[model samples]
Target: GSHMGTIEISSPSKTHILAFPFPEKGHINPMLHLCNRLASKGFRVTLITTISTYKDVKNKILINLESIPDGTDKNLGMNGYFNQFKNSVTESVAGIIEEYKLGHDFPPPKVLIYDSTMPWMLDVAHGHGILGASLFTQPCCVSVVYYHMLQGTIDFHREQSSSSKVLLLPCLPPLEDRDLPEFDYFKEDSGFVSNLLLNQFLNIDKIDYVLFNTFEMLESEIANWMSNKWKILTIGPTAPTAYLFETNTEVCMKWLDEREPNSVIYVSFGSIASLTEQQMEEISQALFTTNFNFLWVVREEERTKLPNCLNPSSESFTTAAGKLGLIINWCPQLDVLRHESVACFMTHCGWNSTLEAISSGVPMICVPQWVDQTTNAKFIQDVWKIGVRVNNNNGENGGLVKKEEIERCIKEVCESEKGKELKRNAMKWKDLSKEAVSEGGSSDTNLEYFASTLLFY
Candidate 1:
């Protein structure tokens, strides 16, 4: 998605930037990309994460890696335990900041950049007199939606029944009720995650800058709209520049090498999100019905729940799935998207996945689960016109998408004339995404301007 290039630093001063990403693959990956980009530009960056996460990514990133005690078991889900983890980070980082400032080992950090989930880091930075910024891992448009929500411009409760209500945010297309996030479309408690996300928008004015992993070329309207309110910087899709999953590249490439060009459908639902057994069975049956050559990544923990059609022991299953589908625990996503054989992406509409698809010029069949995914999928189908969303037939029962609908959506993207148009548009975005990261492009210029300003400040 995002790109990097060799450039002359305007200031020779060594600026130490401390980055703390929320301890998740989706959050960690984009922040790591930004940190690496800053490190490459002469800024000393210390990447702080949980001990387990540090061990997993330390070799993949070039910057200094550090660990903070999350004070919770690693197995706790973000929903159940993130507040404890966030509290730990908020409490621990201040002490680390003091150590860097007073200790002789490394210079004190002059700037702090953290993921949106860690909004308390801005307060810690303020206490330490360091410049702080929030790196939004999602699209800029989603941020603008939260801005409106925090500002009372969009009432979530009142809009649920009026599904036809339209949100006309400046510089972006008018979004109807269904196009907004699932949270906005339905009534919900103001839970930890909800408040955490809204707090990110609420505290935007308090931070030195708001950085998004999106390029201006893709979202010029909303990006410009956000700039009017805050010191915003667009330095994404940061995926292209980061060396993600360096070890698994060969295995993934080998599988793709034997496949025909633009013939493989890559399916993944991101690292954290998983389908229920019912959903998985439907998807499995759909894959069998479509008879399309596919590469499906099933989480190792959930592999035992796979449907009979995907079983290797069944001779009939072998005849269909053995020749048509490949299953793996996980794959190098960007590498898979960039492969010549990947025709379309069956994605959960996570911003990182969305950007990778756009960067690779691959169309998508959006099967969004929740959170910003619903919003991202809406834009993909309604605004970007580069994908179609899978329809859920049984909305009364958790909105499960049936096999037939899944099959239809996949074929629409992989075999129809509309799919060709989607591909054409995707390629147009691919060119623009590349240009935005090149020297003198919008993202490059924005990043350089930000670094130069921080250098002098």
Candidate 2:
């Protein structure tokens, strides 16, 4: 590993960025962090979420650009909570765009960066004079799959048929069809499919430039491939490597500090992934059986999904893994990952989580749910050689996987010699990640190009 240093910009230039995030925890969290990072870099950031979510993050440093929640299906898992939250965000967006239209006081955003799913922003962004940019939260590979999907090589029926494994894409590297999501399986046939396809294609021309949440060195070949194809910049590991640290991190770190090294297995399923009660019980039993220390980031409702480890049901299920298991609703993720005691991560393979784990030098236990996680899992396990996979096909959440699989996997990585080697590899990447964001590193140079060259006319 080489020396990693920081950059010092003498005069801070300002770019007023309007960020409209999708109404989901996973999407909003990383986008908020990005807004905060840019703000710290001296850019004026107006982060827009539904009124309710903005209420959720109010008093935080990042500026809030308000939106009304439309009450779309929030999927909070609680009966009415999700709908209420969604409506709040929808109403917020509708209200704010009208306000911008009426006020005429403030100039349109110098730049509009919205989540890719918010297709309506294409026109709304154009209504304002500034450049409109879509932040593609998925890995570059998934984006390529979508491109093939839009081109009509695959369709919805074929996607669900289980026969399509080799999806022929427009310009991506040779990829198996299974790597593409179910949406891509159907290609342009479905209504949602066409809408997404047209939007991504339009984004290629209608928007100014696309920003990917990834690092350059990690995907040099693919980055170059995309540059030759679309001309967008792949500027990630951006969320993780940024120097902006929240103040509350210490409290979370304090909790992790009390745990034993390599004993705590950090578990989270990114934002929207859920586990049923049966699945949770199976997992609880697995955690209990392993006797390995664990930390689970869970939602309140999901608690009901897990079986009572204390009082086992008549079904002959296992008991809780005992005192070593710790479950919390949510914690500052970056803080916990950096904790010295955390040995391995069992993640849903969200891109941000992937970067965070890699940057932290922790090996992974990949259990990808949806979106780019599958590709990220493949990349981490096959390309990076830094983690193991959980074959939960027989388990509840798409697999028949049980406590034994989780226990065996954790044991192999934590207690076994092979696990130690994987850790060494992770640490090496961790060092490289730091370097990539350092002064004169790939990410730094890309940041300069993005703000100075890419943003400038």
Candidate 3:
């Protein structure tokens, strides 16, 4: 709180900006990091959180925090909580602006930087005559695809058989239908999911600011494609990362010290990914047979799906001990990625992990499971040329990557000559990512420009 100008004394930038992230951990962390960035630049920043989010994060952050009723006292089966937060935030978030305008404890908020998912924030902010900025947490590559979807330039109504046809779009690599996000092919829980994603562009022109958790050099073509359209600002790998997560580092770093350079594989899906027993078994066996030192994060809930012999918690684990990878329930992922011993990341392609991999220079064995992840996987394999993707649809297995398929991908990524090329490309991206956030780099310049002119704007 002291870091937040506790006495509420007027500062260089009298502008008060409210940061609202859609209540998920992935969304919350990035938005909070951006708030910290803005706060450090002398803007008075308060993160608008839900009661539960506040309780979960309260004392842990450096920014000033406040919570509005999130409509649900309760919970992603997607739609249930989608409307709950949407309708609730529409009112409560708006309620705060009005309340503050009457002269509350803080200066009236002048800008609202909100998650792109909740586009209605723009409506509320505009109604209150405050600046509204939509903060995109996804990388620019996926974002361009969404923008195309919103413009109806890309058709989602195509037949399932048509999925393999190549999709040509401005500023993107040629994408086959399978490469696009799964959300596009919907059946109401479907449109229910997609509407929240696509609707961010509904009032696009009205948004005062548009920001991305991306760096221009990483996706320059897509960056240009967007800036030519909107007032786009790429201010990221925001990397506020002063240990908000990633505990239990000592043991992993120590374990990593034993492996040879680029000899280990690190496998983890994002926290929300729920792998089926079949999917988990396939991956477990891949690690088992690949004969490589590996660190795999089998999230707690998903551990039940692991094959009993391979399950780190199961009684028969000793039988597979020599062959099995070091399977932990959680990991300090970025630390593991940055380790010299880690050869490749077997990931679900969540944007955070994607950026982390890019930032770390580790090659990837992509096995994407969800909407944006599939697209991210596509970019990693084809566009970036820094990873190989294991095709989940082996046809005989009904969209599951068979154990052999995972094994084949592991061998290719961890041992083949092609793997060295990926390492070279991965190192290129890694260097560019560092340069992006360096003092005079694209991301830094944008962030500085954003903060310096914030109040003036």
Candidate 4:
């Protein structure tokens, strides 16, 4: 009885899906968006996350939230014992699946959709006789590069120094070493992260579907290649936040309303990335010198270190020296991007924020921190032609960007002729992204098809 779809003859089978997202905000947010989409389509969904994260975003999501023990001590922080945490979660998934069958009267989950970071979940799903789907929160192009790394066709570690050599991967745009993901050990025979990446590839064949948060139009060639080589589905650009809960929008929105059209630069480094004190000093100096209106989101803990020279204050409304910088603890990023006064986004190139900027038709000043961000920064500048990557000059100032370079990048993005051209390209992609998510669009069609496959079984 548990194996069969619900037997109601009057309606289609009541489908149920169990989604397990990696605990970080960036990974968790897109998974929640996917859940909303599936729930809207009439699927019964239960979301799994860590206790703290679930507490934070619980009310924002419509799906059921289930907390899993991450085996992390409160003092160790999120990244501490990450591998052990993953292993613990892996060990517990089988038990969790078993519990689902005994406790719930409804039919068992048709599939277990999990974050790609925990490839171990796929095997657990198999043991329980459920379809396993891996959700990739990063862009498809980045994943394609990783696939080649696992296949040994491209030795990223060995070849990374040669910026001139073209990346030979098929269906992908020309990529140089600087354009690749910032993983330093893909070609090396050893490293914890490298081995983890390899395991992700090994588990790909075990999964029934690989779902991406990018639409086909953004990378059609790579999307098709993934479909033919692996059972991949393009089901996204799943970065919208209109239906979600947001705090302090009126304050930020009111600040934007007072600024000139396309005048304020929005700066956010994402949930995890942080700036060194030296780096912060240089950026603060740049903001002061640019004399431009800006909205900056600094981590709550780091606010104390902001430059005293700027006479920084906590007010939602603050202006000085022909400049307006509204420093906030956290923001409703989607609302910020949607506002008319936002001229550009100064970002760390996280996938969710990048998609949000693209969908909102805003240009970027890409300042990538780590992981897939370097590759994304390259795409923003080269392929998409919608932004420019900051030149950190290999951390010349103790891994800090110079105030001069920051000023230059801001001027180029906001005041230069190149800025105008980039804005045009950004607007173009904005229209395309809208098309992909609309009815009869590429992402919409693919999502419907993916759902059909899930329901068919």
Candidate 5:
């Protein structure tokens, strides 16, 4: 990696921002991005993670940071590498806090940002007088729903039996059962959600600040509602990562530059949204029937073992589409959207991914997979209006998404002028997002607000 550990700061003095994470790839990546952002602006950064997760992160992120040229690549060292791995949730993480203090090698941090799932950090921060904030990597709607449930509005526990099929999201616009958080995913212990979220929400009261990886323009009402409901800051849509792109983005930008606008559909179902053979073929057939230029992100071995539909071989329809489609593990998203030839986004509607699309001014063909994504899809289609939803009926992963529906949704968004208009509005929000992140911009203003309201105090 780029060992420029001497990156200077634009922030006052030389305050260190100590960052820690739970043992998940999804959780670790975002926190690393935040740490990089802070490091770029000249704050000392110390990234902490469990030993096993530390290995995974170091391998993935260390390479990404190689080009960063900032001193942020060096880690602050793991707290309790081994014992922590067995039980990352409870004791191991807690034990690290005490161990770090006893070492006395690291100074007190100006701020502490942790994954909300790791609620133990709340006490860790409170014990050290460090300003603590939680990063809700999930969508604002899901967080709001969970928060409201904790506030005693909707009872996921009581909403068992027939009520399980119902959605009780009072914080956002109307939504249905599939659109609500998957109670069935935790149905065997549905009651656990109440205790988990209540304990998680309790941290909101103790933590000095909270931030979501979302943008206000994309979910302004929800963001506003959430802020009024809790003491936090809006520093998000933190995806599309306009700022994170740097120069390597050109690689993906140039690729999209060659594609036809409104003719190309950007596809990515996220890291965990696996598809079955039938589902993969359905998606392949849908794309073929539409004949739309496409970019699909299929991680290693994800589609490799699938049947003929996603074979990526000469005989497969996906391969026959050939030049019509580009498949890769991952692509620089923000850079691709910024290219003029791009049209709509076919995403799982992950919060960061949605924000990145919004920042680029590209509308979505929402195909939510799991968790709060259904909630996010609702926001994108009904609340935001900047995008349209794909008829993902049958809820494959417990939700429906038939081939015919995928073809039709792609046609409506990519083959229609209204789809182009949505793209224009998406761009408008993207411009607003750019302005917000600019000097003295709204997001910048909030970053400053975080400093004044919580960081310093």
Candidate 6:
């Protein structure tokens, strides 16, 4: 590792905080945002990312983005991908610590903040006499749900279907058994995913700090309830105030500019999720039926699922009433969410995207895919009243949200009186979320306190 110094880093005397995101798309940004906040607060942040993820960050700016071999031949299964990165990092991370610890040119790192999934990292940080903070990628309620299951407080019978029992927990809203992520595969297939989730809490009591990217105003009851058990801190809505990408900014904003305020529905399911042809066709038909001005992102591979009515061109998407919608490959999410024309977000409800929508004051139309997304949808619909959830009443093979259900939810959320109320509810949170990340706000104060405490500890 050569100098690894930054001209953007004005203070060499500032403390260093080493951060390692899981290198997954949704997981990486929160860590980057937190590190960005810390850097702005006069702390040095060195981010550890895998080679491919690092390749992009090098073009864009960061506090300090360093590359490490993730030790994979190709993108494989979820479990293998996760454990492989862990194995690779555990071998090489010691060298990183030693380089910073014994360096003469730069200040040493006092804290090692890693993704919450790698709980054993707490041991490595402790071994190096540094504080270890885990960045939670999911919401507080999701963590509580899984923790309850781990402790045997909430019983989930594997391979058995249809439990009418409502899930109850301390200071948390009662959830249905259907609300569980991956509710369909309740076996060894799910066993792998369950183990991945449970590992985060394996040594929860021993963690130095558990940092969640949620606002106190948003999850106050759950945050307070969970704090009694561990050192949990709600320092979140960890979205950057400004985004600097020019990618699709001009085209998306220009198309949004011609639309009426609060008229366009921004549809995106994020980077990792893929909708089957049936689901896509249903959504495709619904968008045309509603004929509301829309901006829907269908990633390159998933592009073929759309009906022949749509295209990549701006002029080709002329709906029934001659209303316009843009079908594109991708666009910057933060910019799109904040746009005045974007009335609602139809999303997969991944935590980062969920927070982004909430932060932007946009109500949601949740079509949850997997891994805490269902729980995220529940919170959005029932807890916050900022969105509505889709039902699986149509398809038999896996499940489905028919064009009718999609049409109904879209109508109720974007055109009804209750929709306005939902927007109002969302607007209040949007303001609260911004305040939480602003100077002297709850999340800001918490982050500041964490930085100050770690430096002198």
Model 1: per-residue lDDT, tens digit, 101-189? Answer: 88676668887888886788898999888888888988989877777777775566543443457777777787766666665323344
List runs of model 6 lying over 4 Å from the truth: 1-13, 75-81, 158-163, 183-188, 241-246, 308-316, 394-398
Residue 169 accuracy (lDDT) in model 5: 54
By TM-score, the candidates rank as 6, 1, 4, 3, 2, 5
Residue-wise lDDT of candidate 2 within 172-250, one digit each (tens)?
4444543445344233444454455345665576667677776776777777778787777666666555233443455
Model 4 Cα lDDT, one tens digit per residue, 1-457 = 4595655332124777899988888888888888888888878788878776777768676387778786676575334566568777887666777887676665577789999978888888988889899998888888877778888855566433344466777888787666776655232423555555555677787788888998788788888888898868888877653456665677787888888888788999999877877788888777765757889888778776776653233445344457778887777898899888898999999999998898889999988876678889988998888899888756311246778888888889899999999999998999889898889998888788767777773
325-441 per-residue lDDT for model 5 (tens digits):
666666656666666776678888876677777778788988776667777887777766778877656433355477888877776677778777776677788788887767677
lDDT of each: 0.79, 0.66, 0.78, 0.79, 0.63, 0.82
TM-score of each: 0.90, 0.80, 0.88, 0.90, 0.79, 0.91
Per-residue C-alpha lDDT of model 6 across residues 1-457, encoded as one tens digit per residue: 7787655533424678899888787888788778777877777789888887886565445387778886775677767866776788886676798899999765787889999987878888888888899999999989877787778655666332533567677898887755776645444557777877877888888888889999889998988888777868889977875453525778898888889998898999998888888889899888876858889988877787776645343333777756777888778789999999998999999999999999999999999988799889999999999999988874322488898999999989988999999999999998899899888898888887787777552
Considering TM-score, which of the candidate structures 5 and 6 is the better prediction for this target? 6
**Lowest lDDT 10-residue stretch of candidate 4:** 310-319
Location of the lowest summed lDDT over 10 successive residues in candidate 2: 310-319
- Summarize candidate 3's per-residue lDDT along 1-457 as a digit string, tens digits: 3565344434436778888898877788778778877877778888889887787567447477779876773545567766776788999988888877786667788889989988889989998888888999898888777778888855766465534467888888888767878764244466776767788788888888898998898899989988888869998887632234554577678878877887788888977878888788877776766767778887777778888764453221222436425777776777888888888898989988898888888899888877788888888998889999887665321278988978888778777899888989999998888888788989888888776666462
Better structure of 2 and 6 per TM-score: 6
For candidate 5, what is the lDDT?
A: 0.63
Question: Which one is best on TM-score?
Answer: 6
